[PDB]
């Protein structure tokens, strides 16, 4: 409960998920890398242990072969993501 959520903030902040912790305390738009090759770019609004992150200004792109694959691109602002389909959660993309 109380001490557990204290250690939980310390874990999300000073552990591996520091990228999403900075996306949450810094309001960064971060690259959640899917294990299924669908690149969604956007913020991180709700984030926790299992890499479950809710992203704002979400834009999903895919390599869609109709040929030479095009970047299928759409932008649903608010949208949630569970951490199973995620391979990574990277704080900073160059765009």
């Amino acid at each position: 409960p109380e001490e557990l959520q204290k250690r939980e903030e310390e874990e999300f902040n000073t552990g591996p998920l520091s990228v999403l912790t900075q996306s949450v305390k810094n309001n960064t738009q971060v690259l959640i890398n899917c294990r299924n090759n669908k690149k969604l770019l956007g913020r991180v609004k709700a984030f926790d242990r299992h890499c479950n992150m809710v992203l704002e200004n979400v834009k999903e792109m895919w390599t869609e072969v109709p040929s030479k694959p095009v970047n299928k691109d759409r932008y649903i602002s608010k949208m949630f993501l569970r951490g199973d389909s995620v391979i990574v959660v990277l704080r900073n993309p160059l765009i």
Binding site: E11, V19, R35, C51, I87, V88, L94
Partner: protein, 72 residues
């Protein structure tokens, strides 16, 4: 004998090539990978089949992709 904790701790910060389950080999200094095995590197570049291609740097991977991790 050098268990997961000491080995991945002496390589957490050592520039690791970490192969993910789709060809992704990260080349960079890990931040921390605790018992949850959640990886995260600082200034790591992307590789496909060992070819450095991307510049995202400090990126935090779910262990569910991780195939291998070595400190180059």
């Amino acid at each position: 004998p050098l268990n997961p904790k000491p080995f991945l701790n002496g390589l957490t910060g050592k520039p690791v090539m970490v192969k993910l389950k789709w060809g992704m080999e990260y080349k960079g200094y890990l931040v921390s990978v605790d018992g949850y095995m959640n990886m995260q590197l600082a200034n790591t570049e992307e590789y496909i089949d060992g070819a450095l291609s991307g510049h995202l740097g400090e990126v935090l991977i779910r262990c569910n992709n991780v195939l291998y991790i070595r400190g180059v």
